[PDB]
Design a protein around this ligand. Structure first.
Ligand SMILES: Nc1ncnc2c1ncn2[C@@H]1O[C@H](C[C@@H](N)CC[C@H](N)C(=O)O)[C@@H](O)[C@H]1O
Ligand SMILES: Nc1ncnc2c1ncn2[C@@H]1O[C@H](C[C@@H](N)CC[C@H](N)C(=O)O)[C@@H](O)[C@H]1O
Ligand SMILES: OC[C@H]1O[C@@](CO)(O[C@H]2O[C@H](CO)[C@@H](O)[C@H](O)[C@H]2O)[C@@H](O)[C@@H]1O
Lengths: 249, 250
DNA sequence: TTGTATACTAGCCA
DNA sequence: ATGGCTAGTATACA
DNA sequence: TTGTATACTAGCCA
DNA sequence: ATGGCTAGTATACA
């Protein structure tokens, strides 16, 4: 197991003490949305006030671990995003609401509403001096698109010559079960977006915390990009998968 | 103007009393977001708790105007979306969060955050039997794409033959200044979006309300598709532009 | 091919 | 407890 | 070219 | 109070 990367088969809400206050530059949180999924446990079986209470509980434990320059990304569903973001705006300051456009809509069979195709990500910061580096995550143009975008007014601009801001909508397709990156986990997140977070909001060598790491996608991002990692996952199968994913680099 | 198209150059909060309760089938609300724009007035000059108080004010005026079958779309910025939606969930039930992907990001020059390219839209309903008709808003495939999506298992499915759900992310570019649609209004909304909303959530001939109609995009949307319209705008020039836009269809 | 505006600059330093 | 200066910001319409 | 799974049906009726 | 049954749900991986 590489150095700096640290995986625990433990519940975060109980081991939070083992984590020094103000030791983490970035929290990458993909917690249970409150949607009834089966992680081999009932963590995503909560809902309503129950789920939101649990959310704010683990959040109150996690926040004090952020150093003053720290930041946080938190995934959730629109069904609970208003309440969650409202609570977090009392503690931290919201820098962005990033929309993950999964490209592939949820199934079921409804015709009474619009089908789900996005997840919500709150991007919060402790203080106004939060760390943020755009250059590693700039998206470079290809020959054709740069040609289509180039104008003398824009020539030499950083966004045109180096690459543009990924913007607060990320259109990255969800991972097909047969996708090469896919592992046996119900709600695995594309490494693309997690790497974007690690790169833009964690300095090289900084420490990232994933209190609900699942298959360890954030562990992989940190390993590939030279960041330190800490992760918690109550399911040992997912934890072993994370070990595997990391050691294969 | 056509038949069921009522354009009132009146402040909505003083004139909502005139509109009968349980009169409106759909509310298409694009209120000021609280970002500091200039509509010839200080409506968007509010911010923070004072802006959220004014939002609650006009919302409390507008909700009772909904028939038990009615619905509401509300445009907002991620900056005030959590509080506004949190408050609306206590008055109505949320059916969707629609993300308008504007394709063109906001300018400025920042480097210390991700650039704004999406507006938030809350889709709420009074009761669990709200009126929703997906067929008129379905998006049919072209030939090549229908060939790429067809499979024996899918053949005959309504989504493959008639059209697929727009989903809760609508990718539609903002109206360029020189765009045909565009008029002299700072925050004009694409007719595609507004029309999708009107067609999916207002019964033909029903009444839709626009507390702040601006250029009357919703007015056009209802004129075509044959729906009734009541809109309010305090700017006489915006009301003028709306009058023109409506008296140019057919 | 190209000009150009579109709901959502910000950190210093004074 | 405010400004102003700087380096900086994409797409798609006509 | 084709099979196939993917964080988020929903109303009725025995 | 509880299944089961219905009509029904898009893309992009391999
Ligand atoms: N108290 C808890 N402590 C640690 N893990 C938990 C806890 N509660 C739920 N979990 C796990 O958190 C994970 C949430 C997942 N969304 C993580 C997915 C992860 N982003 C991935 O790419 O694989 C699940 O695997 C849960 O089993
Ligand atoms: N009390 C008020 N009553 C009526 N209109 C108002 C009021 N306050 C602000 N407005 C107007 O609300 C409008 C908000 C706009 N975003 C509407 C845009 C509109 N959807 C369009 O396509 O043009 C502005 O034009 C304001 O002039
Ligand atoms: O959490 C930041 C978030 O709050 C908003 C409105 O909800 O602004 C509020 O908080 C700001 C903190 O920087 C204050 O400056 C502002 O006065 C207050 O309204 C959003 O602007 C912002 O995204």
């Amino acid at each position: 197991l590489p150095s700096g990367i640290e995986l625990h088969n433990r519940d975060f809400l109980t081991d939070a003490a083992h984590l020094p206050d103000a030791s983490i530059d970035l929290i990458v949180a993909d917690p249970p949305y409150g949607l009834g999924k089966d992680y081999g446990n009932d963590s995503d079986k909560r809902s309503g006030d129950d789920f939101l209470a649990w959310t704010r509980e683990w959040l109150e434990l996690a926040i004090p671990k952020l150093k003053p320059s720290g930041s946080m990304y938190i995934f959730c569903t629109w069904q609970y995003a208003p309440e969650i973001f409202s609570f977090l705006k009392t503690q931290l300051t919201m820098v962005n609401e990033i929309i993950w456009d999964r490209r592939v809509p949820s199934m079921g069979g409804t015709t009474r509403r619009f089908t789900s195709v996005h997840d919500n990500i709150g991007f919060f910061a402790v203080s106004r001096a939060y760390y943020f580096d755009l250059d590693p995550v700039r998206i470079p143009y290809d020959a054709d698109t740069k040609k289509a975008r180039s104008r003398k007014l824009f020539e030499g601009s950083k966004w045109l010559e180096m690459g543009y801001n990924p913007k607060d909508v990320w259109s990255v397709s969800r991972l097909h079960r047969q996708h090469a990156e896919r592992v046996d986990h119900p709600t695995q997140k594309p490494l693309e977006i997690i790497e974007r977070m690690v790169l833009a909001s964690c300095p090289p060598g900084g420490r990232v915390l994933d209190p609900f790491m699942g298959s360890g996608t954030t562990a992989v991002a940190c390993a590939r990009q030279g960041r330190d990692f800490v992760g918690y996952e109550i399911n040992e199968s997912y934890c072993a998968i994370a070990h595997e994913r990391v050691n294969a680099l």
